[PDB]
């Protein structure tokens, strides 16, 4: 399921939606989403950078 950032700058596990993995917010971007705020495709971000760059783009973003 996609859903909005302000959605998913949630922290409180109770504040967010059943069906997102509160792990992987970026997973529940629509495409156009996830390519306006990360600017780079979804495999190069998940497979191509290591976790911890991953976790520190997403702090940034407010979707760690």
Do not use: C, I, Y
């Given at each position: ?24 917010k ?14 780079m ?24």
């Amino acid at each position: 399921e996609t859903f909005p950032l302000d959605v998913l700058v949630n922290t409180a596990a109770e504040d967010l939606p059943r069906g997102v993995d509160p792990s992987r917010k970026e997973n529940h971007l629509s495409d156009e989403d996830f390519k306006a705020v990360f600017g780079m495709t979804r495999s190069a971000f998940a497979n191509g950078l290591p976790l911890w760059k991953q976790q520190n783009l997403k702090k940034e973003k407010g979707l760690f």
